[PDB]
Amino acid sequence: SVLKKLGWFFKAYWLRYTIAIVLLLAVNVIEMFPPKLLGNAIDDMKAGAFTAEGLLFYIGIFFVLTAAVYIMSYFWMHQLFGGANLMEKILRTKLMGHLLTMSPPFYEKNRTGDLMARGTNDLQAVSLTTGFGILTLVDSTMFMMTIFLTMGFLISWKLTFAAIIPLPVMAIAISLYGSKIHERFTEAQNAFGALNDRVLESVSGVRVIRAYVQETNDVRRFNEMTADVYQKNMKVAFIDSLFEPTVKLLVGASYLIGLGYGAFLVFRNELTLGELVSFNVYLGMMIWPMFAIGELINVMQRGNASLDRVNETLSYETDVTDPKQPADLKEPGDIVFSHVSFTYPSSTSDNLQDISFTVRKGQTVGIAGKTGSGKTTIIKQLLRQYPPGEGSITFSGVPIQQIPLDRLRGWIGYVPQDHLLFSRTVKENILYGKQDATDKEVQQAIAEAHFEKDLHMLPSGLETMVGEKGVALSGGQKQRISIARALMANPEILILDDSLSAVDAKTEAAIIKNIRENRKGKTTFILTHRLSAVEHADLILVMDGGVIAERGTHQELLANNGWYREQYERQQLF
Amino acid sequence: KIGKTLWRYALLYRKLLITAVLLLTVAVGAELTGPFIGKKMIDDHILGIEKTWYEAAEKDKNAVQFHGVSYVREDRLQEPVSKAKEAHIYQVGMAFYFVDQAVSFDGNRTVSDGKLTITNGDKSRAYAAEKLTKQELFQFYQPEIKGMVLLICLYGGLLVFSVFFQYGQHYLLQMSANRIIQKMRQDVFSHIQKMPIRYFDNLPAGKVVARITNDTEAIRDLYVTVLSTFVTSGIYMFGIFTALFLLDVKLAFVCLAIVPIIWLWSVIYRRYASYYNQKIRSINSDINAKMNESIQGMTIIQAFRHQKETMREFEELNESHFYFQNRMLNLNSLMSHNLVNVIRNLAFVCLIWHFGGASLNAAGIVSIGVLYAFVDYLNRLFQPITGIVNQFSKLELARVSAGRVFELLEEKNTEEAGEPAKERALGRVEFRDVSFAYQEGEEVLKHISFTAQKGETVALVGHTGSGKSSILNLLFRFYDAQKGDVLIDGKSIYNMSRQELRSHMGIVLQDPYLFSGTIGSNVSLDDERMTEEEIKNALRQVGAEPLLKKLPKGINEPVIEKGSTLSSGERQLISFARALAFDPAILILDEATAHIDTETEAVIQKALDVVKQGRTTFVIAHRLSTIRNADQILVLDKGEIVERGNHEELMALEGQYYQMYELQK
Ligand SMILES: CCCCCCCC/C=C/CCCCCCCC(=O)O[C@@H](COC(=O)CCCCCCCCCCCCCCC)COP(=O)([O-])OCC[N+](C)(C)C
Ligand SMILES: Nc1ncnc2c1ncn2[C@@H]1O[C@H](COP(=O)(O)OP(=O)(O)OP(=O)(O)O)[C@@H](O)[C@H]1O
Ligand SMILES: [Mg+2]
Ligand SMILES: [Mg+2]
């Protein structure tokens, strides 16, 4: 089962492993000798036939054999360990290449800590099983079979048999134990992801957990989680404590059968006291490793469960936002919505209902409305973050679906409502929309988003190391950087989405002026809660629920006496 | 120290480990008395035929009945009899010859033509022999069948003793290891709980999670596999060597001289393994942090087409991790169980050398049973060294991990935490020449001085970098002011406990954060002092969300981090309700309504905030309408309060506040 899931790797590096198997077989065959040489030496010793020349022969043979086995065993150990390392590397590359190209619908089912586990920990387990697990399995199987045949052909076929009949039941016991251990490792591995995202949640929200005094309830919850994990692991320990003694008892039963039956056979005149030692060394070398082959299953099944987790992650068909579409447009042109009825994956009610608005080739579109009204639900239709709904979004005359995701994302310049910055310098963060700008172009974006002055306050001035998730700057310095991130290029469509929510009534005016001058002929999508930012828009849409109630220009919506006019009067008087 | 700390953690469970080792000793006793039974069987049953013969078997164990008379050899003929010096059997090749005659001497077994041939070079009265072979008459060993069956049954009985005690010891070892890991993880989480905000501010979130979870898991693997195998192997070796010394002292001495060999191999492995594994674990922590950052910001990683450059950065840690892992191939291929076999083939050479040297003097054949036992014990001794070396690799890795972990539990910059709060306190809050500077000389606040008077609302409106949030950080003691004083009710907040201070204040923080649970669990943060204050404190500013929801508010579940399935403005109403739900004596609003439409915000929040005006408030506002009626407005400019007063007195001044107010309308 585990091997078949792992068959893709082995039929890709077959020389590195076929040669390892050949070397392993050779070392096993030439290790079958020392026991028989020792038996012959003891037999010669008893009969008084041992001579110094025989001693020299035996020590020379043992030295040659040990040197050869070491030299040609170091090589296949080096092949198997390197293969395990390579497997870990390829699995990590596949995983982190699959996490990219993955859309929010995937990420709202899988937790970040779960994914960090399904990476680091699962890959470590898979690497451990591939190198050590396959190594031990193959070596033990070859050793067992070669010992069995050697004893059968060189000593006796009736004493070799009946010294293994304890093994059939051993096989059943191993089968049961391994079958239950698989079911207790999918949960043991899963509970690690639950601990990763439990710690990750109490680290990200440290301020909230401390602002409201909750460090003791958090610790209590963590302690309860640890207690549950301990109880689970102790169930596993009970199963393993039942399994190990039976392994040892069957090994001892086999050893006793071999020894006693051989001692009886010497009297039947079928074996010599020298042959005894040889047989009881062969069987010992066969069975004593089973004191650990029982524990081998704990690595095999851990690797099996970890690879199962990794394969669930990897076999997640990319959401319906799959590009899978060539089309020759090259220019967004008009943007027309016609009866769009999108409904979020985790929702039961329509989030949009018969949205039927149009945007020309050069036009600023304002979107206003109440909280949770669908303002950014319209934006995420052009972002291709979720599966398309039940309408049409025809960029020019071409549906949004029939447009490669690479070209569309090049068209769109997006400013998220929730700040998303990285642990880089300010200039590095700004150089996310173009990535190959001169310092002159980065300065232009800074000037446009009224951030030239604030650069003087910063200690480093574009080398300030904004920090993890951007927490080294005020809330409104994070936003302006984001604006620069979207103004670094010259996107055909600039989506703002509440980009002036942290600005001091004078930065807002300056930034609005700069955006008006900058986007005079280009297409913009301004979503705001302050209706003084969309006074210049050629079309304003007022949302409610999912549908749009009011539409028209600013002067048209003040003659409707609707939500827009009431809002404006509430905001233009103070 | 890593070793001392691990030992102390083990001593925290000193009964389970002692009981486990005692049970394992009881099991190993039988496991190793087995071969001693084998030697006894070989030396008394299969080589007993060599003894003297020729009594009429007056009593005891009857006799063999060779030809026409009773024969008993030694063991059951030990009763007073006339044994004489005759009737000695010998083995030559496959032929067993009964001399049946007075044997003078021996030393070289050879009969050829039914003679005595040579006897240590003496040739004492060549004696007539008589071949027996296999089926002629092999009742010669009849007395030994009973002894053999009894020994077999004895060892079979000891096997069940062993099975019980092995179960007991394994269970106890596993339970002790898991308990130790539980305690270590709990201690790690407590220490992270008592860590300054600076630690969390200049460190990736994924790095802390990596440290805690991954290194504690590595320590867990250590305790549950490496140390358990170490204890089992040590006891087994202890027992095997004790047995060996009871057979041959010089051979046992040379075979026991391998413990220094194991120590030297341990040291040589430890050096290189420590270096390479510290590098590997550092790279793995970097990998975890990068994974967290990429997953968190994936929305705009794809929007700006940073996938290829993000794959390039990640693959440089994956490739480096692989490279530093491939430096383990040289060590792990030259010092694996491989070398143990080299020791196995070299420890047997000493056996042959010693026994042959004794044999050449006709002394190494004195006890073939001793040789059999010494071979069995060598096999048993080399069984566990493989596990020893595998655990040697795991042990170096876990030593690095434990060193990483205990670098966290030592940190002396921690902050004392007096959890208990106290009774409600007046909303009086004061600042006195509070100058605060992040990272040394860079001053963000200069000579801040203001005061609330138990009911007054303080606006504190400034420009986008003045330091309005730094005042809150000082007030909440996330950061300690480097000059000046901050007082609540006339007592310095630096003479308080951070928990005591924070119990007075409820804050709507900037960048609202939601937890994975239910909406009602976020308004309450899972605190028992709730009842049905959820709906009442959400009915204010949330009267349209819980209606459309398919579940009734406290049953509908947000998801990881900020509720990804909630609008940015709806996540801020939940934070506002949470702040109001925890009825505070001082209410801090850090732009609490930046993402909320002006209708909801203005009408609902203000109408239901003015009613509860018997409470001090701080309102960091960029919307100057929400702070129009503030009893005292402060203007922060370049980290300095330049203007103070209510709306009328600030507009009459015609300053920064006047400019902003006139611009925002
Ligand atoms: C550290 C934690 C783990 C510890 C694990 C424990 C370690 C493993 C423990 C193993 C215990 C083994 C028990 C032996 C039982 C079976 C053998 C038997 O009874 O017969 C033996 C009795 O032999 C004699 O009477 C002769 C003297 C030798 C005694 C050897 C066994 C007792 C060793 C000392 C005991 C005290 C010391 C106890 C330890 C300090 C052999 O019989 P034989 O060879 O047929 O004798 C005649 C030979 N002849 C015909 C050639 C003359
Ligand atoms: N990922 C999601 N899955 C399911 N429902 C969602 C998701 N995101 C938002 N919603 C819900 O869909 C509705 C529309 O939300 P949307 O984010 O479009 O509103 P909005 O007007 O942008 O919000 P705001 O004014 O608060 O910024 C709300 O009920 C919201 O909670
Ligand atoms: Mg929004
Ligand atoms: Mg702020």
Residue numbers in the entry:
A (entry chain C): 3 to 576
B (entry chain D): 2 to 666
What text appears in the publication on this structure?
Our model heterodimeric ABC exporter, BmrCD, is presumed to be associated with drug efflux in the Gram-positive bacterium Bacillus subtilis. BmrCD is a heterodimer consisting of two protomers: BmrC and BmrD. Finally, a distinct feature of BmrCD sequence is the presence of an extracellular domain (ECD) that caps the TMD.
Finally, while attempting to obtain an OF conformation in a WT background, we determined another OC structure in PC/PA bilayers (cryo-EM dataset 5). BmrCD was incubated with ATP and vanadate (Vi) to trap the high energy state (HES) populated following ATP hydrolysis. The OC in the WT and QQ backgrounds are almost identical (RMSD value of 0.6 Å over 1039 Cα atoms). We propose that the OC structure captured here represents a return step from the OF state, since it is likely that the ATP at the consensus NBS is already hydrolyzed (Step 4).
